[PDB]
Amino acid sequence: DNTPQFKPFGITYYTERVLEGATPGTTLIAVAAVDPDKGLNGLITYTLLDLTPPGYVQLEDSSAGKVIANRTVDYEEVHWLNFTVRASDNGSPPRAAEIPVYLEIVDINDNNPIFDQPSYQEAVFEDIAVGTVILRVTATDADSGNFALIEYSLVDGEGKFAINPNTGDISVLSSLDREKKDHYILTALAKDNPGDVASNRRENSVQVVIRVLDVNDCRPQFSKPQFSTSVYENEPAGTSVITMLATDQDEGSNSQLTYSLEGPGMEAFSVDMDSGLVTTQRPLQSYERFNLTVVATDGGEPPLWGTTMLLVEVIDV
Numbered sequence: 001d002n003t004p005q006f007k008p009f010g011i012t013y014y015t016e017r018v019l020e021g022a023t024p025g026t027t028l029i030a031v032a033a034v035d036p037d038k039g040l041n042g043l044i045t046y047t048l049l050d051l052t053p054p055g056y057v058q059l060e061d062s063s064a065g066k067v068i069a070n071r072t073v074d075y076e077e078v079h080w081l082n083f084t085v086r087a088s089d090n091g092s093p094p095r096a097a098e099i100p101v102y103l104e105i106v107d108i109n110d111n112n113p114i115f116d117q118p119s120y121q122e123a124v125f126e127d128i129a130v131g132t133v134i135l136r137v138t139a140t141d142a143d144s145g146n147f148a149l150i151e152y153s154l155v156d157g158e159g160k161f162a163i164n165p166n167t168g169d170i171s172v173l174s175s176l177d178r179e180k181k182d183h184y185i186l187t188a189l190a191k192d193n194p195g196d197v198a199s200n201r202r203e204n205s206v207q208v209v210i211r212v213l214d215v216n217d218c219r220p221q222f223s224k225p226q227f228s229t230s231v232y233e234n235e236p237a238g239t240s241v242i243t244m245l246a247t248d249q250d251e252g253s254n255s256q257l258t259y260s261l262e263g264p265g266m267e268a269f270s271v272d273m274d275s276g277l278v279t280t281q282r283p284l285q286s287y288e289r290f291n292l293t294v295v296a297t298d299g300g301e302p303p304l305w306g307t308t309m310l311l312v313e314v315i316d317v
């Protein structure tokens with residue numbers, strides 16, 4: 001006439017830690033009760049009750065208190081597997097005892113940081129100030145504690161960009177120049193579990209495009225400061241003299257050039273504003289000598305100019 005008692009004697013409840021992902025059949029906890037009596041009166045049958053939540057645990061067999069994994073548990077869904085163990089003798093009116101079990105699920109680092117976008121992109125002007133934040137990348141991590149802390153890095157900022165390891169803010173580290181490099185495709189990395197060994201850290205990367213927009217910061221240039229040419233005396237107006245060509249490193253209208261003439265010979269010559277072709281406006285006589293100023297002006301606002309000099313001598317036929 002003794003009721004089964006759980007061991008150790010007077011135990012209020014059982015508890016054990018269980019790693020999430022424990023495979024089915026894995027022993028989660030083993031409990032035991034005793035009944036001093038003889039035969040069926042002292043033969044103990046174990047059952048489980050009130051599985052909260054259900055589906056994750058079962059007794060290996062009803063003859064013992066070994067509890068094994070059924071479905072695998074996910075810490076991201078379940079923090080506690082609670083249930084009751086009933087230990088019943090097999091007597092005529094049976095006597096039984098019941099006790100709670102609390103299995104404490106333990107997080108493992110089974111989720112990677114995952115970026116909130118498939119890629120990132122911004123456009124910035126080439127004169128953007130050093131230190132300016134361009135964009136923020138964000139990843140999220142479904143684990144807990146250190147396993148969900150994220151450290152951002154750039155695989156290679158090229159000395160032009162830097163990322164804040166906490167915020168994911170990508171900033172200008174040194175001055176840009178569209179003319180040197182007009183866009184960047186950077187790899188940003190999110191790595192969890194800071195401070196642990198490389199093998200227990202998970203990561204993902206994403207590509208970040210920064211397109212560098214033009215400012216009109218390059219003036220038109222000629223190849224040298226002095227050109228020289230000759231025109232025959234007594235040639236008609238419209239006679240070709242020379243074609244002038246300047247360069248400009250900017251983009252679009254910022255490097256679209258128009259030519260003009262300046263100074264004491266402008267009236268005797270003309271330059272086609274688009275082609276750079278210089279022609280005479282009249283016949284020249286052999287004594288005449290001109291040092292013209294040729295100007296190339298870009299289409300920026302305000303425009304930039306560059307000049308060169310053009311010596312024109314008139315030769316006898």
Ligand SMILES: N[C@@H](CCC(=O)N[C@@H](CS)C(=O)NCC(=O)O)C(=O)O
Pocket residue numbers: 175176177179180217218219249
């Ligand atoms: N040093 C200045 C000007 C740089 C710049 O814009 N240079 C132009 C010409 S105006 C260029 O062609 N840069 C290309 C290079 O240096 O390779 C800056 O850093 O802003």
Ligand SMILES: [Ca+2]
Pocket residue numbers: 001002003004035036037041042089091095
């Ligand atoms: Ca008994």
Ligand SMILES: [Ca+2]
Pocket residue numbers: 020074075076110
């Ligand atoms: Ca999990």
Ligand SMILES: [Ca+2]
Pocket residue numbers: 109110111112113141142143147148192193202
């Ligand atoms: Ca993680």
Ligand SMILES: [Ca+2]
Pocket residue numbers: 020075076107108109110111142143144
């Ligand atoms: Ca986890």
Ligand SMILES: [Ca+2]
Pocket residue numbers: 126176177178179217
């Ligand atoms: Ca530039």
Ligand SMILES: [Ca+2]
Pocket residue numbers: 216217218219220248249250254255298300304
């Ligand atoms: Ca320009």
Ligand SMILES: [Ca+2]
Pocket residue numbers: 126178179214215216217218249250251
């Ligand atoms: Ca430019």
Ligand SMILES: [Cl-]
Pocket residue numbers: 123124125128
């Ligand atoms: Cl900008």
Ligand SMILES: [Cl-]
Pocket residue numbers: 164166
């Ligand atoms: Cl910081």
Ligand SMILES: [Cl-]
Pocket residue numbers: 182183211212
């Ligand atoms: Cl680009």
